[PDB]
Design a protein around this ligand. Structure first.
Ligand SMILES: *[C@@H]1O[C@H](CO)[C@@H](O[C@@H]2O[C@H](CO)[C@@H](O[C@@H]3O[C@H](CO[C@H]4O[C@H](CO[C@H]5O[C@H](CO)[C@@H](O)[C@H](O)[C@@H]5O)[C@@H](O)[C@H](O[C@H]5O[C@H](CO)[C@@H](O)[C@H](O)[C@@H]5O)[C@@H]4O)[C@@H](O)[C@H](O[C@H]4O[C@H](CO)[C@@H](O)[C@H](O)[C@@H]4O[C@H]4O[C@H](CO)[C@@H](O)[C@H](O)[C@@H]4O)[C@@H]3O)[C@H](O)[C@H]2NC(C)=O)[C@H](O)[C@H]1NC(C)=O
Ligand SMILES: *[C@@H]1O[C@H](CO)[C@@H](O[C@@H]2O[C@H](CO)[C@@H](O[C@@H]3O[C@H](CO)[C@@H](O)[C@H](O[C@H]4O[C@H](CO)[C@@H](O)[C@H](O)[C@@H]4O)[C@@H]3O)[C@H](O)[C@H]2NC(C)=O)[C@H](O[C@@H]2O[C@@H](C)[C@@H](O)[C@@H](O)[C@@H]2O)[C@H]1NC(C)=O
Ligand SMILES: *[C@@H]1O[C@H](CO)[C@@H](O[C@@H]2O[C@H](CO)[C@@H](O[C@@H]3O[C@H](CO)[C@@H](O)[C@H](O)[C@@H]3O)[C@H](O)[C@H]2NC(C)=O)[C@H](O)[C@H]1NC(C)=O
Ligand SMILES: [Zn+2]
Ligand SMILES: [Zn+2]
Ligand SMILES: [Zn+2]
Length: 256
């Protein structure tokens, strides 16, 4: 996701922390964050080149199909197993279990927070052949955009402006209300993990969404506008809510 998606996920998550996780997060964040996890939930994107080994950790490349399997797909372009967003979530969650080494656990917190978000963006678990939709060039209303960017940013930005009247917290607040009043039974399933982290579950949902919602109906050169926007917005909402709920549930397990 772009900035807005990560902020939403991290705002939802931080308000769902239990006392032990809330305490650990306050302790691990730098002073400059002013206690707010969401102020640093794009940090991982800002070290893609300084930590160039981290760049493949934001996504999963799959074959042209609707399936994900860790052993088949969780690898970087050189074939190194584990080097994908699912593998990164396992790595950094494991590191945080040691909290109160060799590792910087502030970085581990910021990585797991960002990557729990990215594994929920459908086009972060999608086809190698189109670079997760980056090579699918369309228009978003009147402007050129690639499909990946539409999912990272344009849908959310257009909703924030047109539907939420530029209210920086309107979408968050509406998602939180629905977590309580519309989605309670589902939320319980979203939180449950028979392990500490369950990223493969989330990735498998994501490639299915990439097939059925993101790529579906889209051809190079199309104009995506209201029909696509209104029909895909509920799945964006779902994935943001899932990401926030699962980030909190995972941190609660780690720090508990
Ligand atoms: C899980 O989370 C962890 C933590 O975030 C991730 O760890 C990171 O993993 C990446 C690789 O995936 C590492 O980067 C690579 O590091 C090696 C060198 O590794 C040694 O040096 C590291 C840096 O040390 C200096 O800096 C520190 C900090 O300032 C100082 O303290 C030191 O004194 C040094 O000055 C050091 O971090 C490494 O230690 C880690 O590993 C050891 C085990 O060996 C542990 O004991 C430690 O506790 C610690 O965990 C280690 O000592 C580089 O060689 C890599 O770069 C080369 O290769 C790249 C291609 O693969 C290429 O792009 C680069 O240009 C570079 O290429 C050059 O060198 C090659 C080899 O010689 C040549 O072939 C090539 O031609 C060219 O010349 C790369 O930088 C991170 O260091 C590591 N970070 C940490 C903190 O551990 C992990 O990836 C995560 N995994 C998943 C799945 O999420
Ligand atoms: C665990 O990991 C985090 C994230 O990587 C580290 O936090 C980062 O620390 C660095 C400093 O090491 C901060 O950058 C500095 O920010 C200040 C203020 O903007 C700059 O003045 C400073 O610039 C100087 O140093 C650079 C060194 O390369 C030079 O390029 C410049 O020219 C200039 O001389 C530098 O940019 C990051 O902002 C900060 N990131 C975050 C997200 O907080 C942890 O480092 C610790 O915490 C820091 C706040 C600071 O107190 C460090 O001294 C601490 O080590 C790191 N924890 C570790 C290693 O224990
Ligand atoms: C929070 O949950 C509420 C309730 O589900 C969401 O509002 C509902 O949004 C749906 C669209 O996802 C609306 O349904 C649509 O209505 C039109 C017109 O009838 C129809 O063409 C579509 O086929 C679809 O049925 C629904 O009217 C609306 N409900 C209410 C009471 O306003 C809301 O969007 C959710 N917000 C977030 C952030 O999740
Ligand atoms: Zn992202
Ligand atoms: Zn992206
Ligand atoms: Zn990212």
């Amino acid at each position: 996701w772009g900035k807005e998606g990560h902020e939403i996920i991290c705002k939802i998550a931080q308000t769902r922390l239990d006392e032990t996780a809330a305490k650990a997060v306050k302790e691990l964040l730098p002073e400059s964050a002013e206690g707010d996890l969401s102020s640093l939930c794009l940090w991982a994107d800002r070290v893609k080149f300084r930590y160039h080994w981290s760049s493949p950790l934001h996504y999963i490349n799959t074959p042209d199909a609707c399936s994900y399997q860790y052993n088949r797909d969780c690898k970087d372009e050189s074939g190194e197993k584990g080097r994908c967003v699912a593998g990164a979530i396992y790595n950094y969650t494991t590191q945080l279990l040691s909290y109160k080494s060799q590792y910087n656990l502030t970085e581990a917190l910021l990585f797991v927070s960002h990557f729990m978000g990215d594994i929920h963006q459908p086009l972060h678990v999608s086809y190698a052949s189109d670079k997760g939709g980056n090579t699918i060039e369309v228009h978003w209303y009147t402007r050129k955009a690639n499909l990946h960017h539409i999912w990272d940013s344009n849908i959310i930005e257009t909703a924030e402006a047109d539907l939420y009247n530029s209210a920086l917290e309107g979408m968050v607040d509406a998602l939180k209300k629905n977590i309580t009043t519309e989605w309670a039974d589902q939320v319980k399933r979203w939180e449950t993990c028979t392990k500490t982290a369950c990223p493969d579950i989330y990735a498998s949902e994501g490639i299915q969404a990439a097939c059925d919602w993101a790529y579906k109906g889209v051809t190079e050169g199309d104009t995506l506008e209201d029909e696509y926007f209104y029909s895909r917005l509920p799945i964006v909402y779902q994935r943001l809510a899932q990401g926030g709920v699962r980030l909190a549930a995972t941190l609660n397990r780690i720090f508990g």
